[PDB]
């Protein structure tokens, strides 16, 4: 989305240890400016998590964005591998 509007999908508490907060966030990855980078987790009907909260370094994040494989967040990847 553009300008000032529905950005709530970005400012959720993506996981129990979510460190991203609308009131304090600043860019970290080279690809960020005013919004946190996110990754789609294929668990169940799927959900989005903050890349930063998954403790992913930039190169890993970039590889994920370029690949066609499914991603499972730290909370669900173990269930997916079982």
């Amino acid at each position: 989305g553009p300008l000032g509007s529905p950005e709530f999908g970005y400012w959720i508490t993506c996981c129990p240890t979510c460190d991203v907060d609308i009131n304090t966030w600043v860019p970290f990855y080279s690809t960020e400016l005013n919004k946190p980078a996110m990754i789609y987790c294929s668990h169940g009907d799927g959900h989005w998590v903050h890349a930063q909260c998954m403790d992913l370094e930039e190169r890993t994040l970039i590889h994920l964005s370029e690949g066609s494989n499914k991603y499972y967040c730290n909370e669900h990847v173990q269930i997916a591998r079982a």
């Binding site: 990855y29 080279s30 690809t31 960020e32 980078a37 990754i39 789609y40 989005w48 964005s65």
Partner: peptide
């Protein structure tokens, strides 16, 4: 995987 805000700066 699908991602948001990952376009090269």
């Amino acid at each position: 995987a699908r991602t948001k805000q990952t376009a090269r700066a």
